């Protein structure tokens, strides 16, 4: 016995029950894994220097406050 | 619908259950507290009969094998022939006064 083949009826109603969720924000999953390697490798060396400078800045800020107290 | 479950492997397809057509293959433990009482009664009765002999005969101290139990000590079956000679006791006479004797131990 034959039957139905295909229909898109009721599918738009189902998709909007819980809505079409908005896309993820642009700041959420932003990793350049497969990109241009020469630029990726260079950015790592800059980031390592930024982390080292961040640690040094907190050391001087803490020492200055302790001297005042 | 199945979902994210483990694959069961329950191992119960061998007619172990007693029903109208099968005798079954089961073992229960309803006599456990009764058998505990009976064994205790026999131990007290044996002590009364053999008085004043000790309940258990003397046994040696041995080392457990393999690397997992290298450092552990327990009791062995019986004393060695070399050990009995060192203490000056005959083996057949030793069994008479309540000393267990083992003729297979090696004393390495």
């Amino acid at each position: 016995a034959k039957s139905k083949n295909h229909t898109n009826h009721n599918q738009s109603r189902k998709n909007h029950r819980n809505g079409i969720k908005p896309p993820l924000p642009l700041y959420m999953y932003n990793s350049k894994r497969g990109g241009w390697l020469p630029a990726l490798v260079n950015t790592r060396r800059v980031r390592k220097n930024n982390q080292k400078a961040a640690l040094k800045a907190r050391r001087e800020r803490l020492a200055a406050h302790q001297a005042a107290q | 619908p199945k979902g994210n479950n483990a694959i069961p492997h329950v191992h119960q397809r061998k007619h172990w259950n007693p029903c109208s057509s099968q005798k079954g293959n089961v073992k229960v433990f309803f006599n456990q507290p009764a058998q505990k009482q009976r064994r205790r009664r026999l131990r007290l009765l044996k002590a009364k009969k053999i008085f004043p002999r000790p309940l258990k005969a003397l046994r040696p101290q041995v080392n457990c094998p393999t690397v997992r139990y290298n450092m552990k000590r327990r009791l062995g079956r019986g004393f060695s022939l070399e050990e009995l000679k060192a203490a000056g006791v005959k083996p057949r006479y030793a069994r008479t006064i309540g000393i267990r004797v083992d003729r297979r131990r090696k004393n390495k």
Partner: protein, 151 residues
């Protein structure tokens, strides 16, 4: 259900134009792309290499990767009850700079200019007023125009 390949409904979509055939010009070659830009994805159909799928023709997205002869763009796409952020790699010929933010940027430039001038407007037709015709015609649906609509 038969014959759904990579280019199914593309007879008129990837056709070039009338009297506008050819290959990309120098102005296209000299365009500069940088990460964070907005671009439109349109096919060229004279460059077979790096041509995007038919779904992404006419779509607008942001670039996340720059390569020696290619650009990577992030494009939204609704699937069932959600939109997926897709990444496509295309050649620089199938990509155009987008003007979808020039009005916004021009608004910012005007605001700072207005503040800069202040540191150193329109006529509403909605409100009423006097009207002096000096002449008044009449519309009357003459019988001549009824006779006109006869081919």
């Amino acid at each position: 259900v038969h014959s759904h390949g990579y280019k199914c409904g593309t007879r008129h979509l990837f056709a070039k134009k009338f009297r506008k055939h050819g290959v990309p010009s120098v102005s296209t070659i000299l365009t500069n792309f940088k990460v964070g830009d907005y671009v439109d994805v349109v096919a060229d159909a004279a460059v077979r290499a790096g041509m995007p799928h038919k779904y992404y023709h006419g779509r607008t997205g942001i670039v996340w990767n720059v390569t020696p002869r290619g650009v990577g763009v992030i494009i939204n796409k609704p699937v069932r009850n959600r939109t997926v952020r897709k990444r496509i790699c295309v050649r620089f010929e199938h990509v155009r700079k987008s003007r979808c933010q020039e009005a916004f940027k021009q608004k910012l430039k005007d605001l700072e200019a207005f503040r800069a001038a202040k540191k150193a407007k329109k006529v509403s037709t909605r409100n009423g007023g006097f009207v002096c015709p000096k002449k008044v015609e009449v519309l009357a649906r003459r019988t001549a125009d009824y006779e006109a609509m006869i081919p």
